[PDB]
Amino acid sequence: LVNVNLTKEMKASFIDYAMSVIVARALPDVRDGLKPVHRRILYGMNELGVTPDKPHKKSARITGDVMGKYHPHGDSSIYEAMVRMAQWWSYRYMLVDGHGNFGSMDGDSAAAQRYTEARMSKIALEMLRDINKNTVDFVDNYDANEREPLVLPARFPNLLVNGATGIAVGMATNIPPHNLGETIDAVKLVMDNPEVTTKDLMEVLPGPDFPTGALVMGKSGIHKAYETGKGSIVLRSRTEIETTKTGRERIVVTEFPYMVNKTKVHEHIVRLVQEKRIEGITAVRDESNREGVRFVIEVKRDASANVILNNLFKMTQMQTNFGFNMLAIQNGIPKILSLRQILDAYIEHQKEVVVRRTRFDKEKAEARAHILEGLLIALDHIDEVIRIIRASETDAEAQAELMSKFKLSERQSQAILDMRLRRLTGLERDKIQSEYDDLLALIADLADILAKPERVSQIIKDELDEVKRKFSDKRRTELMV
Amino acid sequence: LTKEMKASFIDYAMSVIVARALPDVRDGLKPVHRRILYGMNELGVTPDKPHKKSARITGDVMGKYHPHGDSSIYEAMVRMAQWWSYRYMLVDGHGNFGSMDGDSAAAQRYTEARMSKIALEMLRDINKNTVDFVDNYDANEREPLVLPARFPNLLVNGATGIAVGMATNIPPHNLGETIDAVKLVMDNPEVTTKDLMEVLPGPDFPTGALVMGKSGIHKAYETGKGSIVLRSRTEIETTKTGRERIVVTEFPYMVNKTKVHEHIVRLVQEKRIEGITAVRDESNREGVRFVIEVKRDASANVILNNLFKMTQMQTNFGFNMLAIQNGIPKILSLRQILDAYIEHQKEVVVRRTRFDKEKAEARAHILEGLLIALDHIDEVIRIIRASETDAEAQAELMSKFKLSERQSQAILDMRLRRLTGLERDKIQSEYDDLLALIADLADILAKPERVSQIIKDELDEVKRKFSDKRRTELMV
Amino acid sequence: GNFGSMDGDSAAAQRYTEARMSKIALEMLRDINKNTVDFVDNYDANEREPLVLPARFPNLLVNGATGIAVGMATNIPPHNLGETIDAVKLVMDNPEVTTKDLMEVLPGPDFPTGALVMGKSGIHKAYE
């Protein structure tokens, strides 16, 4: 069978086994927290240029395209994450704009692979634009040729606020979600104020949010989990007693906390009927739910319906003991972070992002500056260089005489030599001079941004406010003590 | 009314006859086959690349024109692959085409073909405005009504017409014999029919036969009417047991072996010579082994004359020998094919000369502008520095020297690489070369015999490239 | 598909041209093995085409014809089939019958819509 005798290669293959199973499935990353397959989806959708501006497209074709541009990995988790980042209700924020059959929230994952027709959302335009941006190393695949980026850089801790699902690999962890607006607020307060305290930002930060809209009670678990990320908290559904025209009372729920089925709990209600461990209950009904979710339990008189609500949030699954585990990974090794340290690593990432983008733009401007330096030096002593080309013979003689007379490089001399008559009007000569000084002003501006670091902070805050303007984030949940 | 009905009769009869009856004198190439070769040249894919297996070619053909069947277009393809029927050669192909056997190759697109070697030089000079064009009914692409030629294929491949008024037999001939006939009529406008007997000893076949007559050939090349003998080859050899064995290789043309053999079996089996149960007619993939053995107490020659009376081993092959030119049919003789091909090639060469003068004098005008630019430069530079517009620069150049608009703008098309003096001498050298070639073409245009010499040049080109002998062994 | 019923709207949906035939060609012609009709050859003169349509049936006598504007005009007006079979079989078993006694067998020239016919002098002229 095995007959493998060398324990050393067993240990080495076992370390690669463990770390590769880590790297494969979902991890608390530095910059996106995502699966690498998510990164694959995003980078393929970007570099194919499939915008939401353009119309919809059959997406299983795109799935096979990305699968063929990448490794021959299995289709299952691919199509799973394809659905998951198109599910509007599960992830708090919108990524993939599907068009087909999914199942709403009640245990029917419709998997119509033929009908896989979709687009994306407009938030990847805020997520990543690294076309020219020297940011991230690449790994090569098909006989080691074609790029794949290591990480997903951004200007945005959105995926902090999204939430994570990486549990069964080694030890368990997740990321519970918040909303974005007060996140922007507390972040900018740390930006302009690098020496703030936790609880004063808890004054800025409400509870961990949920897309359905949850009733939150208690803050001791909030105190523990904003610090150390461990503990379960209690969650209740928006549930009311309503009187009829007859005086009969009605238990009316609006939503539920996270990871709840209507139908499994409904079967559990029918159990509780036939289990004969709860009384009073008459009608278990649910209709018209697509204009708005409306599930109604209706109970006879002389029953103490609020005590029955107490019995619901004691024994039924309507009560939620929602636990946290945010056990981080920063450059491979597992860690654990406070809410400050997350944003700190975000800050220094934005530092490196804007610095490297500015240096790429710097080298753009420097190269074009050397171009226009050569142009203006050609404009200096024109007829002498006319005599030069009327005299000399070769590339070597021309470059030697131009370097002796004007101290320029070879490419500069040849770009001089590539000047035609139709770029010899004094109009375009002074337009060269004008755009030359424009780029000089841009170089000086970027050097001034290199002088002081806080301009980066200010521009980040500006475009955070732009995103919060285009993406107003009202609340949906409710916190109590 | 009835005059308009007569107009419809005349015009529609012209449509049908020019459609599917005899082609022009100028090409000898039927317009179906003409468009086959034109679209296969406009495939562009060389015969050097391996020849294709597709009906996409014929789909573009049917997009070029709607017939009463593209299966007939494929029939035209296959009948131009019939080397055993139509001579050398118009198809570079691979697929099933059979022989003169009764073969049915239903695999239509499954055959391979592309351009052929003779077609390559046969249809050059499209890029020289030599031949006129007409638009299709589809109003999108054009087509030529005639073709340029490098030989009278009229004589190379014959004609087997249909009787719309009457059909037409035209026999094939030989390559180099036709070349010698061209040279003969070129050197002498005073040739005779015996001269034609010299440079053409006789019409030949891709298979071979025997033509015993002489004056039928004489009336064929003079009157255009007459019938000949087509005879099978006969070889009388000795069986080891004493039988006058008959070996046959050649045959009359358009004569399958199969039904002839069946009628021979019938004539045996109708109370006649029945002891000839010896018909060894096989192994014909090396050649033709059509061997019988005459029975004992019977001579071979009587059975030979009886099968000549069966009109299949000896056949009166007639000739109608008609043609189409200037919208009319015509009874044929030589100095008509001959002078027609001569003056057609005159048209082609002279119009090619005119087009080459067009290109050469246009480029000469360019290099005029180039050398006049390279005379004096820096003053033009400094006056350009006193300007800000290419229209102003054009007006400045018109004030400076005599140029064209194209010349002025091409002088504006000068980077700094253009500012040397060696390339001045190079442009001057090619300028004098081009002036010398223009004067050469003008002197050739003031030379009638030089055209004939160019015709001799192309004849010697195709003669060094190819030749063919008389495979059809003819005794008279 | 789409045709238009009888009121001047010839629907010509060439894309929608989806069809079958009727079961009467099984009575019309079965010449597979049947040495009946010469053939003419087309694409470089190879493939068959029959000269005529033989049958066992004068059905197309009873159908009707439309050949008018070519030279002079002619048609074939239709009958029905049953009394046609009757009068034909009477001529078969009786080769020496008269016209009007078969007009006793043959009603007027028929029409598919169902027409009111008056008069028989034109019937006398046109059957002759």
Numbering used by the authors:
A (entry chain B): 6 to 486
B (entry chain A): 11 to 486
C (entry chain D): 105 to 232
Show sentences the authors wrote.
DNA gyrases are type IIA topoisomerases found in bacteria, archaea, and some eukaryotes (plants [Evans-Roberts et al., 2016] and plasmodial parasites [Dar et al., 2007]) and are capable of relaxing positive supercoils and introducing negative supercoils into DNA as well as performing other topological manipulations. Unlike eukaryotic type IIA enzymes, which are large homodimers, gyrase is an A2B2 heterotetramer formed by two GyrA and two GyrB subunits. The GyrA dimer forms two gates that facilitate DNA passage. Here we present two different oligomeric structures of Streptococcus pneumoniae GyrA-ΔCTD forming an open dimer complex with a 44 bp unbroken DNA oligonucleotide.
The Dihedral complex, built from four GyrA-ΔCTD open dimers, was obtained by mixing GyrA-ΔCTD with 44 bp oligonucleotide and ciprofloxacin. CryoEM analysis showed that the complex is formed by four dimers of GyrA-ΔCTD in the open conformation and linear DNA threading through the dimers. Maps calculated with the DNA subtracted and with D2 symmetry achieved a higher resolution for the protein parts of the assembly (5.2 Å). Calculations in Relion 2.1 imposing D2 symmetry and using particles where the DNA contribution had been subtracted from the images gave a reconstruction to a final resolution of 5.16 Å according to the 0.143 Fourier Shell Correlation (FSC) criterion. In order to model all other protein subunits in the assembly, symmetry operations were applied to the dimer, which is the asymmetric unit in the Dihedral complex. The interactions between dimers in the Dihedral complex are mediated mainly by contacts between the N-terminal tail of a monomer with the N-terminal tails and WHD domains of adjacent dimers as well as WHD-WHD and WHD-tower domain interactions. For the Dihedral complex dimer solved with D2 imposed symmetry rmsd values for bond length and bond angle are 0.005 Å and 0.888° respectively, with 92% of the residues in the favored part of the Ramachandran plot and 99.7% of residues with favored rotamers. Comparison of the cryoEM open dimers with the B. subtilis open dimer show different degrees of gate opening, with the largest for B. subtilis and the smallest for the Dihedral dimer.
